[PDB]
Amino acid sequence: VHVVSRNAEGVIVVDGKAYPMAEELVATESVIQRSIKAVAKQIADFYRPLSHRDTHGGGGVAPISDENPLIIISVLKGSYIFTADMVRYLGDYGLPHVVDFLRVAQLLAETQFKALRGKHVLILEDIVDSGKTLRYILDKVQREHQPATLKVCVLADKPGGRRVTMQPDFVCLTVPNKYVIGYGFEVNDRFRCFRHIFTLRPGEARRYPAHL
Amino acid sequence: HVVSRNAEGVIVVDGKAYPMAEELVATESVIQRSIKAVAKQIADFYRPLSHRDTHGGGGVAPISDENPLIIISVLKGSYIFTADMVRYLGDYGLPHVVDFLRVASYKMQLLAETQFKALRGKHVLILEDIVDSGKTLRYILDKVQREHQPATLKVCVLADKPGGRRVTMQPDFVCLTVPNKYVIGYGFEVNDRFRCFRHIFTLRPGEARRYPAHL
Numbered sequence A: 001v002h003v004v005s006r007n008a009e010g011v012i013v014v015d016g017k018a019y020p021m022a023e024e025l026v027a028t029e030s031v032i033q034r035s036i037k038a039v040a041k042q043i044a045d046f047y048r049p050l051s052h053r054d055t056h057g058g059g060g061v062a063p064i065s066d067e068n069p070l071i072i073i074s075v076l077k078g079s080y081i082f083t084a085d086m087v088r089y090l091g092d093y094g095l096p097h098v099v100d101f102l103r104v105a106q107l108l109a110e111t112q113f114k115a116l117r118g119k120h121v122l123i124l125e126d127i128v129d130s131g132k133t134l135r136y137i138l139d140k141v142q143r144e145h146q147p148a149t150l151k152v153c154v155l156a157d158k159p160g161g162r163r164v165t166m167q168p169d170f171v172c173l174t175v176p177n178k179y180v181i182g183y184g185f186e187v188n189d190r191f192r193c194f195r196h197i198f199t200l201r202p203g204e205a206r207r208y209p210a211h212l
Numbered sequence B: 001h002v003v004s005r006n007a008e009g010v011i012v013v014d015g016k017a018y019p020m021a022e023e024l025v026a027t028e029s030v031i032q033r034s035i036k037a038v039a040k041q042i043a044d045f046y047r048p049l050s051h052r053d054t055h056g057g058g059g060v061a062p063i064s065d066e067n068p069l070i071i072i073s074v075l076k077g078s079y080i081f082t083a084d085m086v087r088y089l090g091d092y093g094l095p096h097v098v099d100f101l102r103v104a105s106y107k108m109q110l111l112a113e114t115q116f117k118a119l120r121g122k123h124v125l126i127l128e129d130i131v132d133s134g135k136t137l138r139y140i141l142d143k144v145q146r147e148h149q150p151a152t153l154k155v156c157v158l159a160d161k162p163g164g165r166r167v168t169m170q171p172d173f174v175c176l177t178v179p180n181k182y183v184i185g186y187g188f189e190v191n192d193r194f195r196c197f198r199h200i201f202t203l204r205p206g207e208a209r210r211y212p213a214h215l
């Protein structure tokens, strides 16, 4: 159980640690991890039955296996902690998979995987808010890799912030229509190390204006 | 944890078989206890230090959320280790930020550059999965020092394979010491396979060319 309280300064305290930058708690580590593991079982149950191009034994189609694993593309930098946890749960459920990374801001870093044609590909992303970043990534991966199927798993969905149509295939958590921090979520790279997700106090997104 | 061998002689950890493994090096519990211990050492070492103030356009200021410790994680092998380390560093209250670089051998070449552009006069810590020959980290350390001119440059490794050294390299922080064998699990892999394992194992010698096709 997590002990959630407020100190004399009105600041949220979780397990004895103060979060002066936070407005409200969204989810404790225990809720987050249970949510990720639940989605991990959904992903393993969905993909383990499927088949795709055979690049190990010369063709044509073969079941997802260690020889022909599910291809996972993780979006850096926001999804790295979520991806680290998700892949370990996927391993627990016996899903054969491999992970590669793309970095976006503009594309800053490209995938090194060069044989995704006719493969099942899953994108791990931290959050869908406006839908624009995933629309950009999905168009690029489809056009350059020509996968058999392309699906998206997000840690968080902020359904009220949409500016374009984007419905992820897998969602671990629904977040309020507020700026979130913690468990990968940042303010200029600060707060990603938190084990819990919180809403940010209004105006604190300008707390660290200096480029790192 | 329960670690045994089945009737086929295959290592089984917590009811799970690892037919590719020769020996178990470390269980999840040992690895996690080891990482948190080094996190306390890193927090105890950096907490009281000061460096260039880029927040208040000042001269020098203590390590803080305004001027955090700069952490550079070496992709891809270090991402799981880094994810866990940062959360332990947060438990110990070390203000820090993380960026990523990626190197490969052909001789070494940079695959992905860091995006941080104000590291001069800052304390920098490299997070790497393993030091074996020492060649990758001598390359990374030489490049970060020359291009960023940090105040201090230190290295934390999840694993030290002491018997593999071909150039002088002793990381400042080491979570685990591994045998002089090919390790797998917890970030370590064979063509990207086995990274998801929660335990570290040695690889059976005939399993290293099992997945020859490029991904």
Ligand SMILES: O=c1[nH]cnc2c(CN[C@@H](CO)CCP(=O)(O)O)c[nH]c12
Residues within 6 Å of the ligand: A075, A078, A126, A127, A128, A129, A130, A131, A132, A133, A134, A178, A179, A180, A181, A185, A186
């Ligand atoms: O709430 C939040 N807290 C911290 N960061 C974010 C982001 C930025 N995330 C990137 C993806 O990594 C773009 C998503 P999109 O284009 O879909 O808006 C949206 N909401 C939040």
Ligand SMILES: O=c1[nH]cnc2c(CN[C@@H](CO)CCP(=O)(O)O)c[nH]c12
Residues within 6 Å of the ligand: B077, B128, B129, B130, B131, B132, B133, B134, B135, B136, B137, B181, B182, B183, B184, B188, B189
């Ligand atoms: O044993 C191992 N199992 C799985 N991978 C490796 C690597 C590759 N790791 C790089 C950094 O990612 C360091 C190379 P080095 O220090 O030799 O220059 C060395 N040993 C092993």
